[PDB]
Amino acid sequence: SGFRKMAFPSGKVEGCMVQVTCGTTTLNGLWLDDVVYCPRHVICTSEDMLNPNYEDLLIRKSNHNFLVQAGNVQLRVIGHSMQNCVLKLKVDTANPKTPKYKFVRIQPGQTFSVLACYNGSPSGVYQCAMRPNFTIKGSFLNGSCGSVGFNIDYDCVSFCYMHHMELPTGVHAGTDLEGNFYGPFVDRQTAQAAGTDTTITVNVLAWLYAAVINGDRWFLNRFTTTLNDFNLVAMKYNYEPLTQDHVDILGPLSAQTGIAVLDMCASLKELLQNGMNGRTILGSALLEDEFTPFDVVRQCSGVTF
């Protein structure tokens, strides 16, 4: 009973967070085995930020210029290299708290948990979706860079995001753990802007299924639609076109509730065209798109890690 934006338990990730300082700049790093991963802009001063030449900046940096701290204890940096927008700092001690892990480049529309950190210490945990325009809606301040996004599957942590920047619309951009940005963003202080914030249609539908399971049924109508006719209406509202793959992904929720996906599309079409009329669905007055079909199944089935 009840449906909330739920983050994964952060314990396994908390044991990996370290503080990385280079000169005056301090940010977070992720310590897995004998390597610490962190944003490469840790080597920049405020002046450098406008048009940095990271390769040039890095020649003036040796292993000893990187101060790595895990709690109150200093790690010894024995090597360093830049891979795309991240630095990999080889340290002399394997993290004893390293969980079972993998690095994953996540698809737009998928969700993950962010463990927001400052000075290598955890501050909070919240769920995010990698939006179609490759931004996330987070909560990050100066010093948050290096904070990571992850998913847990049983005992294995899949890290998928490292925080690097904010955009003018108050949204956030960052990289996978290989240092490659999601979207067209670059790690420099330039004029960059998020494209159209397209809505994750399959996730709105999954959330409509979670509402039905949790007793909210007012929006169910007596109509149905086709994929092509629904997409004509959803193009107007900047919704992602729904495909047969999306319908198959919603298969289990549709079977659990007895509501065909195209019947849920017709209900969603009525909600887009007519609005909620002051009503709420799972405590919200807007259509929510940051729950995947798996998030709904997980939460409504009590999946543990």
Ligand X SMILES: *C(=O)[C@H](C[C@@H]1CCNC1=O)NC(=O)[C@@H]1[C@H]2CCC[C@H]2CN1C(=O)CCc1cc(F)cc(F)c1
Does residue 258 belong to the site contacting ligand X (CB under 6 A)?
A: no
Identity of the residue, 1 or 228, whose beta carbon is nearer to ligand X in the bound complex: 1
- Map residues 65-104 to x or -, x wherever contact with its own copies holds by CB under 8 A: ----------------------------------------
Give the whole-angstrom CA distance, residue 213 versus residue 286: 18
Cβ 179 to ligand X shortest distance, Å: 13
67 interacts with, out of ligand X, its own copies, none, CB within 5 to 8 A per kind: none
Site for ligand X in 234-253 (CB under 6 A): none
Identity of the residue, 57 or 276, whose beta carbon is nearer to its own copies in the bound complex: 276
Among 81, 121, 226, 238, binds its own copies (CB under 8 A): 121
According to DSSP, residue 168 is labeled: T
According to DSSP, residue 281 is labeled: B
Does residue 41 belong to the site contacting ligand X (CB under 6 A)?
A: yes
Q: Tell me the sheet residues that pair with 124.
A: 116
41 interacts with, out of its own copies, ligand X, none, CB within 5 to 8 A per kind: ligand X
Cβ 58 to its own copies shortest distance, Å: 28
Among 13, 70, 114, 165, binds ligand X (CB under 6 A): 165
Q: Is 252 helix (H, G, I), strand (E, B) or coil?
A: helix
For residue 195, the tally of other CB atoms under 10 A from its CB is: 12
Site for ligand X in 44-73 (CB under 6 A): 49
Sign of CA dihedral 38, 44, 46, 49: negative
Beta-sheet strands, E only, within 167-297: 172-175
Among 7, 58, 67, 186, binds its own copies (CB under 8 A): 7
With tokens 């890290």, the residue in question is 159
Cβ 155 to ligand X shortest distance, Å: 25
Does residue 9 belong to the site contacting its own copies (CB under 8 A)?
A: yes
Give the whole-angstrom CA distance, residue 53 versus residue 300: 49
For residue 3, the tally of other CB atoms under 10 A from its CB is: 21
Does residue 19 belong to the site contacting ligand X (CB under 6 A)?
A: no
Tokens of 198: 């397209």
Does residue 38 belong to the site contacting ligand X (CB under 6 A)?
A: no
**Residue type at 36 in one-letter notation:** V
Among 57, 58, 171, 262, binds its own copies (CB under 8 A): 171
Sign of CA dihedral 180, 186, 189, 194: negative
Among 93-101, 181-189, 215-223, 255-263, the segment contacting ligand X (CB under 6 A): 181-189
Does residue 116 belong to the site contacting its own copies (CB under 8 A)?
A: yes
Which sequence positions are flagged as catalytic? 41, 145
165 interacts with, out of its own copies, ligand X, none, CB within 5 to 8 A per kind: ligand X
Give the whole-angstrom CA distance, residue 131 versus residue 174: 12
Cβ 124 to its own copies shortest distance, Å: 4
Does residue 302 belong to the site contacting ligand X (CB under 6 A)?
A: no
Give the whole-angstrom CA distance, residue 88 versus residue 146: 12
Tokens of 182: 């999601």
Closest CA to 135 of 87, 53, 200, 85: 200
Give the whole-angstrom CA distance, residue 239 versus residue 245: 16
Site of interaction with its own copies (CB under 8 A):
1-11, 14-15, 115-119, 121-126, 137-144, 166, 170-172, 214-215, 280, 283-286, 298-305
